[model samples]
Target: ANIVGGIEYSINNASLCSVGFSVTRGATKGFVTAGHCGTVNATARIGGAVVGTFAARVFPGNDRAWVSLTSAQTLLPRVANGSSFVTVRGSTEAAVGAAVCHSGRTTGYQCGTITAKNVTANYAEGAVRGLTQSNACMGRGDSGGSWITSAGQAQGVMSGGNVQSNGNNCGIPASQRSSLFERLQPILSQYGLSLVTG
Candidate 1:
C-alpha cells in the first residue's frame, strides 16, 4: 500500500511511498513524493489503474520527485487522516521544536516535535543534505511519506529513519527513532512548481 497526497498509489507493481501534496506547473497537474521511491519515467498507478508518470527524481543528495498525472486523475489538496482529511493551506515550512505529524501506509499517522533543521543524513546511497530531524517513529515502507504540521503547514517528505527490529516486522520506539526528511521548499523552487493549496 503506497500513498500519494493521502491517496494510495503503486508503481511498477510495488508499493511506492507516501505523497506530499498536489502540485501544478502552469496548467499541468501532478504530485510530489520522495525521490527514493522512484526515478524518471516510472509509471505510477492507483490500484490497477494507470494514473501518472514520474517526471523527475533527485535522491542521494535529496529526496524529491514530481509525478505528472494523466488527464484522468485530479489533484486534490487534502490529506486523508483516518475518516477525515486535513486541508493543505500553504507550503510554509515549520520551525524547529514545532509540533508536526505525518501520515504513511505503514505507520498511519504519528506526531512529534521537530528536533533539528538543515540536518545531513548519511544514507548508504550517499549523504542527503538539508533534511529535518524528528523524533517520530517510521519503518521501511514509510519512506516517501508526507510530513505536515498539525496546523496545516507543509513540512517535508520522509527520507529514512533508524529502524528497530521487532520480531518479523520493522518497529521503532517513538522516543528512540530519529528520522530524516527532505524539505519541500527546495523541491518547489527547483521544479518550478507551486503547491496546490486551497
Candidate 2:
C-alpha cells in the first residue's frame, strides 16, 4: 500500500477489498460493501496490511458489512483506477435518472446511466429491495465498487447488476441508500468515530 493524496492505499492482492465506499464508526474506521465479496473472517489490506478484520457481514439479506479497522484511525475515503486516485468528499445521495460511474479492480473505471428507482432484485444469494438500477456492466470482482456521479457525488455501492433482466445493471439508488449511512452516522458519532472524508 502507498499514500496518495493523503490517503493510504494498498493493492488488494485477492481483490477482497476492491472498490468499496468507507464509513467510520467511533474511533474505528471501516468500510461497507457486499458481504458476498469475501468472508467475514477474512483479512483486508490497505496502505500496509491487515487494515482491518471483517467484523460484520450480511449475505443474502442485504449484501453489506461493517469492517472494523484494526487499531487504525484516519483511513481516507477515496477511490482509484489502479493508477490515479479520487477523493470522495461530502456525499449527497444521487437523484433518479442521474449518471454514475465506478472503479473496480476487475474492470478499472466504467460509466453508466441510472435506469430505475425502488427496484427489487433477486440474485443467486437472495432478494434485495429498494435498489437503484443502472446500465453499467459489472462482473464477479466488481461486487463492491463505489458508484459516483458526475459531480463526484457518491450515489451507491456496486453490489450486483442486471444480466438477464432489464434495468438491473446499476446499483442501489442514491435516495434509497442515504438512510443506511444516515442511520449509522449518529451511532458512529457517539463512538467518536469520524469518517475521514465527510
- The whole-model lDDT of each prediction reads 0.78, 0.55
Model 2: what TM-score?
0.71
lDDT of 1 at 63: 85
Ten contiguous residues minimizing lDDT sum, candidate 1: 166-175
What number of backbone clashes does candidate 1 have, counting pairs of residues 3 or more apart or in separate chains? 0
Q: In candidate 2, what are the lDDT values of residues 1-198, reduced to their tens digit?
A: 321121222223465435366676655667655566667677766645666667766666555555566654445567664577667775666665667777665556676667676676677868866667766555445666666665656665566653323332335543332211112222233334444463
Model 1: per-residue Cα lDDT over 24-47, one tens digit each = 888888888889888789888877
Tell me model 1's lDDT, rounded to 2 decimals.
0.78
Candidate 2: regions farther than 4 A off: 1-17, 46-48, 72-74, 163-194
